[PDB]
Amino acid sequence: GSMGDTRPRFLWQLKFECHFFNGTERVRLLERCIYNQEESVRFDSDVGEYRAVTELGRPDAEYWNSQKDLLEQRRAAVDTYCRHNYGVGESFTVQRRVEPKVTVYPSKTQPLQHHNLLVCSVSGFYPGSIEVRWFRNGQEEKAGVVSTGLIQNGDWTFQTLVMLETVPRSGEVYTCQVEHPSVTSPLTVEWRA
Amino acid sequence: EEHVIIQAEFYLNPDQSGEFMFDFDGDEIFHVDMAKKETVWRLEEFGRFASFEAQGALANIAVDKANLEIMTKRSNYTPITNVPPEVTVLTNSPVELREPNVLICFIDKFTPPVVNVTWLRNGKPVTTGVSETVFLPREDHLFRKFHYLPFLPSTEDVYDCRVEHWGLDEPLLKHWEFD
Protein backbone atom coordinates (compact mmCIF):
# COMPACT_ATOMS: atom_id res chain seq x y z
CA GLY A 1 0.00 0.00 0.00
CA SER A 2 1.42 3.44 -0.75
CA MET A 3 -0.54 5.47 1.88
CA GLY A 4 -2.19 4.79 5.21
CA ASP A 5 -5.75 5.11 6.48
CA THR A 6 -7.32 2.33 4.43
CA ARG A 7 -10.85 2.84 5.83
CA PRO A 8 -13.62 2.32 3.23
CA ARG A 9 -14.59 5.43 1.29
CA PHE A 10 -18.02 6.50 -0.02
CA LEU A 11 -18.26 9.11 -2.81
CA TRP A 12 -21.22 11.12 -4.15
CA GLN A 13 -20.84 13.28 -7.27
CA LEU A 14 -23.27 15.57 -9.11
CA LYS A 15 -22.64 16.82 -12.63
CA PHE A 16 -24.76 19.37 -14.43
CA GLU A 17 -23.65 19.37 -18.10
CA CYS A 18 -24.67 22.04 -20.58
CA HIS A 19 -24.01 20.93 -24.19
CA PHE A 20 -23.98 23.68 -26.85
CA PHE A 21 -24.33 23.25 -30.63
CA ASN A 22 -23.83 26.15 -33.08
CA GLY A 23 -23.40 28.83 -30.46
CA THR A 24 -26.55 28.45 -28.34
CA GLU A 25 -28.83 27.48 -31.24
CA ARG A 26 -29.17 23.99 -29.76
CA VAL A 27 -28.70 23.27 -26.03
CA ARG A 28 -28.96 20.01 -24.09
CA LEU A 29 -28.86 19.84 -20.26
CA LEU A 30 -27.80 16.53 -18.69
CA GLU A 31 -27.85 16.26 -14.87
CA ARG A 32 -26.19 13.16 -13.43
CA CYS A 33 -26.05 11.74 -9.89
CA ILE A 34 -23.16 9.32 -9.36
CA TYR A 35 -22.53 7.10 -6.35
CA ASN A 36 -18.93 5.77 -6.13
CA GLN A 37 -18.33 5.19 -9.79
CA GLU A 38 -21.88 4.37 -10.89
CA GLU A 39 -24.36 6.88 -12.29
CA SER A 40 -27.69 6.19 -10.56
CA VAL A 41 -30.19 8.76 -11.94
CA ARG A 42 -30.24 11.52 -14.54
CA PHE A 43 -32.28 14.40 -15.95
CA ASP A 44 -31.89 14.73 -19.72
CA SER A 45 -33.61 17.81 -21.21
CA ASP A 46 -34.21 15.88 -24.42
CA VAL A 47 -36.32 13.43 -22.34
CA GLY A 48 -37.88 15.97 -19.98
CA GLU A 49 -38.12 13.92 -16.75
CA TYR A 50 -35.76 12.11 -14.43
CA ARG A 51 -34.86 8.54 -15.28
CA ALA A 52 -33.15 5.90 -13.17
CA VAL A 53 -29.92 4.61 -14.67
CA THR A 54 -29.45 1.81 -12.12
CA GLU A 55 -31.68 0.22 -9.53
CA LEU A 56 -30.23 2.49 -6.78
CA GLY A 57 -31.70 5.58 -8.46
CA ARG A 58 -35.32 4.40 -8.81
CA PRO A 59 -36.65 6.02 -5.57
CA ASP A 60 -35.24 9.41 -6.60
CA ALA A 61 -36.63 9.45 -10.12
CA GLU A 62 -40.07 8.57 -8.73
CA TYR A 63 -39.93 11.22 -6.03
CA TRP A 64 -38.57 14.03 -8.16
CA ASN A 65 -40.92 13.36 -11.06
CA SER A 66 -43.86 13.82 -8.65
CA GLN A 67 -42.88 17.47 -7.95
CA LYS A 68 -44.39 19.60 -10.69
CA ASP A 69 -42.60 22.84 -9.84
CA LEU A 70 -39.27 21.02 -9.81
CA LEU A 71 -39.87 19.56 -13.28
CA GLU A 72 -40.88 22.96 -14.61
CA GLN A 73 -37.68 24.52 -13.30
CA ARG A 74 -35.56 21.76 -14.72
CA ARG A 75 -37.21 21.94 -18.15
CA ALA A 76 -36.56 25.72 -18.25
CA ALA A 77 -32.93 25.39 -17.16
CA VAL A 78 -31.63 25.21 -20.75
CA ASP A 79 -32.56 28.90 -20.77
CA THR A 80 -32.13 30.08 -17.15
CA TYR A 81 -28.93 28.07 -16.52
CA CYS A 82 -27.17 26.85 -19.68
CA ARG A 83 -27.78 29.80 -21.98
CA HIS A 84 -27.29 32.23 -19.07
CA ASN A 85 -23.86 30.85 -18.08
CA TYR A 86 -22.82 30.56 -21.71
CA GLY A 87 -23.34 34.30 -21.98
CA VAL A 88 -21.47 35.11 -18.76
CA GLY A 89 -18.26 33.54 -19.91
CA GLU A 90 -18.37 33.71 -23.73
CA SER A 91 -15.88 36.55 -24.19
CA PHE A 92 -13.04 34.85 -22.25
CA THR A 93 -13.79 31.16 -22.95
CA VAL A 94 -15.47 30.62 -26.36
CA GLN A 95 -13.55 33.61 -27.78
CA ARG A 96 -10.21 32.79 -26.13
CA ARG A 97 -7.42 32.56 -28.72
CA VAL A 98 -3.76 32.26 -27.68
CA GLU A 99 -1.10 31.93 -30.40
CA PRO A 100 1.34 28.96 -30.22
CA LYS A 101 5.05 29.41 -29.64
CA VAL A 102 6.82 27.32 -32.31
CA THR A 103 10.43 26.15 -32.08
CA VAL A 104 12.44 23.70 -34.17
CA TYR A 105 15.61 21.93 -33.10
CA PRO A 106 17.49 18.68 -33.78
CA SER A 107 16.86 15.96 -31.19
CA LYS A 108 19.70 15.31 -28.78
CA THR A 109 19.32 11.66 -29.75
CA GLN A 110 20.42 10.93 -33.29
CA PRO A 111 19.50 7.24 -33.35
CA LEU A 112 20.40 6.69 -37.02
CA GLN A 113 23.67 7.58 -38.72
CA HIS A 114 23.42 9.78 -41.86
CA HIS A 115 19.96 10.91 -40.67
CA ASN A 116 18.80 13.97 -38.71
CA LEU A 117 15.89 13.62 -36.29
CA LEU A 118 14.12 17.05 -36.17
CA VAL A 119 11.72 18.24 -33.46
CA CYS A 120 8.95 20.81 -33.82
CA SER A 121 7.63 22.00 -30.46
CA VAL A 122 4.36 23.88 -30.37
CA SER A 123 3.42 25.27 -26.96
CA GLY A 124 1.26 27.66 -25.00
CA PHE A 125 -1.74 27.71 -27.34
CA TYR A 126 -5.57 27.81 -26.96
CA PRO A 127 -7.97 26.32 -28.02
CA GLY A 128 -6.82 22.72 -28.54
CA SER A 129 -7.76 22.46 -32.23
CA ILE A 130 -4.44 22.55 -34.15
CA GLU A 131 -2.61 21.02 -37.06
CA VAL A 132 1.22 20.65 -37.00
CA ARG A 133 2.86 19.42 -40.22
CA TRP A 134 6.35 19.04 -41.65
CA PHE A 135 7.26 20.09 -45.19
CA ARG A 136 10.32 19.22 -47.26
CA ASN A 137 10.74 22.10 -49.76
CA GLY A 138 7.18 22.55 -50.99
CA GLN A 139 5.96 19.00 -50.24
CA GLU A 140 4.13 17.91 -47.10
CA GLU A 141 5.94 14.96 -45.44
CA LYS A 142 3.86 11.92 -44.49
CA ALA A 143 6.37 9.15 -43.88
CA GLY A 144 8.46 9.11 -40.72
CA VAL A 145 6.39 11.70 -38.90
CA VAL A 146 5.67 11.06 -35.24
CA SER A 147 3.25 13.21 -33.23
CA THR A 148 3.02 13.18 -29.43
CA GLY A 149 -0.59 14.27 -29.73
CA LEU A 150 -2.36 17.05 -27.93
CA ILE A 151 -1.44 17.64 -24.29
CA GLN A 152 -3.68 19.81 -22.05
CA ASN A 153 -1.48 21.66 -19.46
CA GLY A 154 -4.33 22.34 -16.96
CA ASP A 155 -3.92 26.16 -17.20
CA TRP A 156 -5.89 26.98 -20.31
CA THR A 157 -3.02 26.17 -22.66
CA PHE A 158 -2.02 23.14 -24.70
CA GLN A 159 1.19 21.85 -26.25
CA THR A 160 2.26 19.27 -28.79
CA LEU A 161 5.46 17.99 -30.36
CA VAL A 162 6.00 16.55 -33.86
CA MET A 163 9.24 14.80 -34.92
CA LEU A 164 10.58 13.97 -38.41
CA GLU A 165 13.43 11.56 -39.37
CA THR A 166 15.24 13.22 -42.31
CA VAL A 167 18.15 12.49 -44.68
CA PRO A 168 19.21 16.10 -45.27
CA ARG A 169 20.61 16.98 -48.72
CA SER A 170 21.99 20.25 -50.15
CA GLY A 171 19.27 22.61 -51.29
CA GLU A 172 16.64 21.05 -49.06
CA VAL A 173 14.62 23.18 -46.64
CA TYR A 174 12.50 21.63 -43.88
CA THR A 175 9.61 23.67 -42.47
CA CYS A 176 7.34 23.07 -39.46
CA GLN A 177 3.94 24.58 -40.35
CA VAL A 178 1.17 25.26 -37.80
CA GLU A 179 -2.53 25.88 -38.47
CA HIS A 180 -4.47 27.20 -35.48
CA PRO A 181 -7.58 29.44 -35.01
CA SER A 182 -5.47 32.22 -33.45
CA VAL A 183 -3.80 33.05 -36.80
CA THR A 184 -5.19 33.63 -40.27
CA SER A 185 -1.92 32.63 -42.03
CA PRO A 186 -0.07 29.51 -40.86
CA LEU A 187 2.94 29.94 -38.59
CA THR A 188 6.14 28.50 -40.10
CA VAL A 189 9.60 27.79 -38.69
CA GLU A 190 12.33 26.61 -40.99
CA TRP A 191 15.38 24.36 -40.55
CA ARG A 192 17.85 24.77 -43.47
CA ALA A 193 19.86 21.61 -44.32
CA GLU B 1 -19.32 24.71 -32.92
CA GLU B 2 -19.50 22.36 -29.85
CA HIS B 3 -18.80 23.37 -26.25
CA VAL B 4 -19.67 21.88 -22.86
CA ILE B 5 -19.95 23.63 -19.48
CA ILE B 6 -20.04 21.35 -16.41
CA GLN B 7 -20.90 22.21 -12.82
CA ALA B 8 -19.25 19.33 -10.94
CA GLU B 9 -19.48 18.74 -7.21
CA PHE B 10 -18.66 15.90 -4.87
CA TYR B 11 -18.65 14.91 -1.25
CA LEU B 12 -16.42 12.14 0.18
CA ASN B 13 -16.66 10.29 3.55
CA PRO B 14 -15.07 9.62 5.96
CA ASP B 15 -12.77 12.43 4.85
CA GLN B 16 -15.59 15.04 5.02
CA SER B 17 -14.11 16.44 1.81
CA GLY B 18 -16.30 18.49 -0.55
CA GLU B 19 -15.66 20.15 -3.89
CA PHE B 20 -17.56 22.50 -6.21
CA MET B 21 -16.19 23.65 -9.60
CA PHE B 22 -17.18 24.74 -13.12
CA ASP B 23 -15.39 23.31 -16.19
CA PHE B 24 -15.39 24.58 -19.81
CA ASP B 25 -14.19 22.11 -22.50
CA GLY B 26 -12.02 20.33 -19.89
CA ASP B 27 -10.46 23.43 -18.25
CA GLU B 28 -11.45 24.72 -14.84
CA ILE B 29 -13.21 28.12 -14.78
CA PHE B 30 -13.34 28.37 -10.97
CA HIS B 31 -13.81 26.35 -7.83
CA VAL B 32 -14.99 27.27 -4.35
CA ASP B 33 -12.44 26.99 -1.51
CA MET B 34 -14.43 25.21 1.20
CA ALA B 35 -12.24 26.41 4.06
CA LYS B 36 -12.11 30.08 3.05
CA LYS B 37 -15.69 29.96 1.63
CA GLU B 38 -14.56 31.92 -1.41
CA THR B 39 -14.60 31.68 -5.20
CA VAL B 40 -11.14 30.95 -6.62
CA TRP B 41 -10.68 31.70 -10.35
CA ARG B 42 -8.38 29.43 -12.36
CA LEU B 43 -6.84 32.41 -14.20
CA GLU B 44 -6.87 35.55 -12.11
CA GLU B 45 -8.38 37.79 -14.84
CA PHE B 46 -11.57 35.70 -14.91
CA GLY B 47 -12.56 37.32 -11.62
CA ARG B 48 -12.58 40.71 -13.19
CA PHE B 49 -14.97 39.54 -15.91
CA ALA B 50 -17.44 37.42 -13.96
CA SER B 51 -18.60 36.61 -10.43
CA PHE B 52 -19.95 33.61 -8.52
CA GLU B 53 -21.60 33.76 -5.07
CA ALA B 54 -19.66 31.17 -3.06
CA GLN B 55 -22.41 30.71 -0.44
CA GLY B 56 -24.49 28.91 -3.11
CA ALA B 57 -21.76 26.29 -3.48
CA LEU B 58 -21.68 25.80 0.32
CA ALA B 59 -25.45 25.27 0.43
CA ASN B 60 -25.16 22.64 -2.33
CA ILE B 61 -22.35 20.86 -0.52
CA ALA B 62 -24.41 20.58 2.66
CA VAL B 63 -27.16 18.85 0.67
CA ASP B 64 -24.53 16.65 -1.07
CA LYS B 65 -23.23 15.55 2.36
CA ALA B 66 -26.72 14.64 3.60
CA ASN B 67 -27.40 12.75 0.33
CA LEU B 68 -24.11 10.84 0.58
CA GLU B 69 -25.22 9.55 3.98
CA ILE B 70 -28.58 8.45 2.46
CA MET B 71 -26.83 6.65 -0.46
CA THR B 72 -24.27 5.02 1.83
CA LYS B 73 -27.06 3.40 3.82
CA ARG B 74 -29.25 2.69 0.76
CA SER B 75 -26.39 0.76 -0.93
CA ASN B 76 -25.96 -1.41 2.21
CA TYR B 77 -22.66 0.41 2.93
CA THR B 78 -21.02 -0.44 -0.41
CA PRO B 79 -17.67 1.42 -0.54
CA ILE B 80 -15.90 2.72 -3.59
CA THR B 81 -13.41 0.50 -5.45
CA ASN B 82 -10.00 2.23 -5.66
CA VAL B 83 -8.75 2.98 -9.18
CA PRO B 84 -5.08 4.02 -9.18
CA PRO B 85 -3.81 6.91 -11.29
CA GLU B 86 -1.67 7.08 -14.42
CA VAL B 87 1.03 9.69 -13.99
CA THR B 88 2.96 11.73 -16.64
CA VAL B 89 5.68 14.38 -16.16
CA LEU B 90 6.46 17.00 -18.75
CA THR B 91 7.65 20.61 -18.91
CA ASN B 92 5.65 23.66 -20.06
CA SER B 93 7.96 24.14 -23.05
CA PRO B 94 11.37 22.95 -24.28
CA VAL B 95 13.87 23.63 -21.54
CA GLU B 96 16.93 25.88 -21.88
CA LEU B 97 19.73 26.06 -19.29
CA ARG B 98 19.20 28.91 -16.83
CA GLU B 99 15.86 29.95 -18.44
CA PRO B 100 12.98 29.52 -15.94
CA ASN B 101 10.47 26.79 -16.84
CA VAL B 102 7.76 24.71 -15.15
CA LEU B 103 7.51 20.97 -14.47
CA ILE B 104 4.02 19.50 -14.73
CA CYS B 105 2.89 16.30 -13.00
CA PHE B 106 -0.34 15.09 -14.60
CA ILE B 107 -2.26 12.58 -12.46
CA ASP B 108 -5.13 10.98 -14.41
CA LYS B 109 -7.88 8.34 -14.31
CA PHE B 110 -8.21 7.72 -10.56
CA THR B 111 -10.74 7.59 -7.76
CA PRO B 112 -11.54 8.36 -4.93
CA PRO B 113 -10.31 11.97 -5.17
CA VAL B 114 -7.56 11.71 -2.59
CA VAL B 115 -3.94 11.61 -3.82
CA ASN B 116 -0.57 12.53 -2.37
CA VAL B 117 1.97 14.17 -4.73
CA THR B 118 5.58 15.04 -3.79
CA TRP B 119 8.19 16.69 -6.02
CA LEU B 120 11.76 15.42 -5.40
CA ARG B 121 14.89 17.23 -6.57
CA ASN B 122 17.94 14.96 -6.51
CA GLY B 123 15.85 12.63 -4.35
CA LYS B 124 14.88 15.33 -1.75
CA PRO B 125 11.41 16.87 -1.33
CA VAL B 126 11.00 20.35 -2.89
CA THR B 127 8.17 22.68 -1.98
CA THR B 128 9.46 26.04 -3.25
CA GLY B 129 6.69 27.66 -5.24
CA VAL B 130 4.69 24.49 -5.99
CA SER B 131 1.01 24.77 -6.90
CA GLU B 132 -1.77 22.37 -7.74
CA THR B 133 -5.25 22.19 -9.15
CA VAL B 134 -8.36 20.76 -7.47
CA PHE B 135 -9.75 17.36 -8.64
CA LEU B 136 -11.03 17.76 -12.18
CA PRO B 137 -13.89 15.59 -13.60
CA ARG B 138 -13.73 12.93 -16.35
CA GLU B 139 -16.60 11.42 -18.38
CA ASP B 140 -15.94 7.98 -16.83
CA HIS B 141 -16.49 9.66 -13.40
CA LEU B 142 -12.83 9.29 -12.46
CA PHE B 143 -10.66 12.36 -11.71
CA ARG B 144 -7.68 14.34 -13.09
CA LYS B 145 -5.27 16.65 -11.25
CA PHE B 146 -2.17 18.76 -12.08
CA HIS B 147 0.78 19.70 -9.85
CA TYR B 148 3.28 22.35 -10.93
CA LEU B 149 6.88 23.16 -9.95
CA PRO B 150 8.69 26.25 -11.30
CA PHE B 151 12.37 25.63 -11.71
CA LEU B 152 15.68 26.88 -13.07
CA PRO B 153 17.04 24.18 -15.40
CA SER B 154 20.50 22.79 -14.69
CA THR B 155 22.60 19.90 -15.88
CA GLU B 156 23.20 18.94 -12.21
CA ASP B 157 19.56 18.56 -11.07
CA VAL B 158 17.25 15.62 -11.58
CA TYR B 159 13.54 15.58 -10.68
CA ASP B 160 10.83 13.05 -9.81
CA CYS B 161 7.09 13.30 -9.15
CA ARG B 162 6.13 10.74 -6.44
CA VAL B 163 2.41 9.81 -6.41
CA GLU B 164 0.62 7.81 -3.68
CA HIS B 165 -3.00 6.61 -3.80
CA TRP B 166 -5.04 3.86 -2.06
CA GLY B 167 -5.12 1.95 -5.31
CA LEU B 168 -1.32 1.71 -5.63
CA ASP B 169 0.72 -0.97 -3.81
CA GLU B 170 3.93 1.11 -4.14
CA PRO B 171 4.38 4.77 -4.91
CA LEU B 172 4.70 5.74 -8.52
CA LEU B 173 7.85 7.71 -9.38
CA LYS B 174 8.03 9.54 -12.73
CA HIS B 175 11.40 11.05 -13.69
CA TRP B 176 12.58 14.17 -15.55
CA GLU B 177 16.17 15.18 -16.46
CA PHE B 178 17.56 17.86 -18.76
CA ASP B 179 18.21 16.31 -22.17
Binding site: L70, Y81, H84 | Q7
Partner: peptide, 13 residues
Protein backbone atom coordinates in the same frame (compact mmCIF):
# COMPACT_ATOMS: atom_id res chain seq x y z
CA UNK C 1 -22.24 38.95 -15.08
CA UNK C 2 -22.91 36.26 -12.51
CA UNK C 3 -22.68 32.51 -12.85
CA UNK C 4 -25.85 30.73 -11.64
CA UNK C 5 -25.71 27.26 -10.16
CA UNK C 6 -28.25 24.45 -10.37
CA UNK C 7 -29.55 23.58 -6.87
CA UNK C 8 -28.95 20.06 -5.57
CA UNK C 9 -32.13 18.20 -4.60
CA UNK C 10 -32.69 16.04 -1.52
CA UNK C 11 -32.81 12.29 -2.31
CA UNK C 12 -35.88 10.23 -1.41
CA UNK C 13 -36.07 8.75 2.08
Amino acid sequence: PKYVKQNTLKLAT
